[PDB]
From a paper:
Protein Phosphatase 1 (PP1; 37.5 kDa) is the most widely expressed and abundant serine/threonine phosphatase. All phosphoprotein phosphatases (PPPs), including PP1, require two metal ions at their active site (M1 and M2), which activate a water molecule to hydrolyze the phosphate group from substrates. Inhibitor-3 (I3) is an ancient inhibitor of PP1 with putative roles in PP1 maturation and the regulation of PP1 activity. In addition to a canonical RVxF motif, which is shared by nearly all PP1 regulators and inhibitors, and a non-canonical SILK motif, I3 also binds PP1 via multiple basic residues that bind directly in the PP1 acidic substrate binding groove, an interaction that provides a blueprint for how substrates bind this groove for dephosphorylation.
We also determined the crystal structure of the reconstituted I3:PP1 complex, where both proteins were expressed separately in E. coli and co-purified (2.5 Å resolution). The structures are identical (RMSD = 0.24 and 0.36 Å2 for PP1 and I3, respectively) and thus all further discussion is focused on the mammalian (Expi293F) produced I3:PP1 complex. In both the reconstituted and co-expressed I3:PP1 complexes, both metals are present at the catalytic site. Unlike SDS22, which selectively binds an inactive form of PP1 (only a single metal at the active site), the I3:PP1 complex contains two metals at the PP1 active site and thus should be capable of dephosphorylating substrates. Our structure shows that the I3 CCC motif binds across the active site. Taken together, the NMR, crystallography and SPR data show that the CCC motif binds in a dynamic, fuzzy manner at the PP1 active site, instead of a single conformation, which is essential for both PP1 binding and inhibition.
Residue numbers in the entry:
A (entry chain C): 27 to 31, 39 to 61
B (entry chain A): 6 to 299
The structure:
Amino acid sequence: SLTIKKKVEWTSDTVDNEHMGRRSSKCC
Amino acid sequence: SLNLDSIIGRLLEVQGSRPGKNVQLTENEIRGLCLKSREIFLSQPILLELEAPLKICGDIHGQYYDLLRLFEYGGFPPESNYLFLGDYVDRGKQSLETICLLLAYKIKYPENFFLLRGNHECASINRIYGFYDECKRRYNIKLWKTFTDCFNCLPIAAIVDEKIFCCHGGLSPDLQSMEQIRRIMRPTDVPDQGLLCDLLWSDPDKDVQGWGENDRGVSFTFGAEVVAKFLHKHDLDLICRAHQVVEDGYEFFAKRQLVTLFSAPNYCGEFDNAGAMMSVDETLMCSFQILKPA
Ligand SMILES: [Mn+2]
Ligand SMILES: [Mn+2]
């Protein structure tokens, strides 16, 4: 239909990788 | 005059091929895409109010093959609604095929396909990091200036169901009301400082309390507390941004109050990353589709 003009929750398979030490880079 | 379905068909012909097959559209077809997309961008708000269901994607950076994989997993339009967070060109080898397909889908579906402005949709940046060299080699300098005029009209932020705030970079110390974004006039360049700059450049940082100097040399960093205060002030539930490479394609921050999306796998070479796409259904129930490197 149309997209352009509730609560946000996550599915069971979604894991929280915040404190998992996942590496991230701002550039290369 | 703009044969949109033939352009899309030629762009999708290399589907099923080994990564690297080019699609050489005509200069007039690409210029037609830019002009028609530009007028559609200007007719729509600079702060998009969107509705679920839709799929949100991060940086592509000219990796056209992985953009087609992303469309295969989530469904080519109009099977699914799409929102891209910017950074479509530079670094990659096929920035032209990438941006042309996204612009064509924006023209073919102006109410179910949306593109936000990243810091690489800027002439000061993409002149250096690859897109200008790709335009000069395969076309001419004049077509690159046409892309710039189109990039200067891209929307800056999007809000999904009044609950998910979306931008390329992140928050700004000059962002107090959403009306400040809506009043930004287009076409416009990306300044070195201010609200528009921070929305395309800023980053979250765990080891920063409040606002700090960003080591990119541009904009600022913000902590988990700036996110929580920003969400509470505007009754938002989640910040959705990109702009940073992440190992799993996504990365949570501030206890799932902010997420970083990156949709270009094997981006750094010295660091192997995956690509991710965020799926949001009508009830704002979100999940992640992961694009494993090829
Ligand atoms: Mn970026
Ligand atoms: Mn980027």
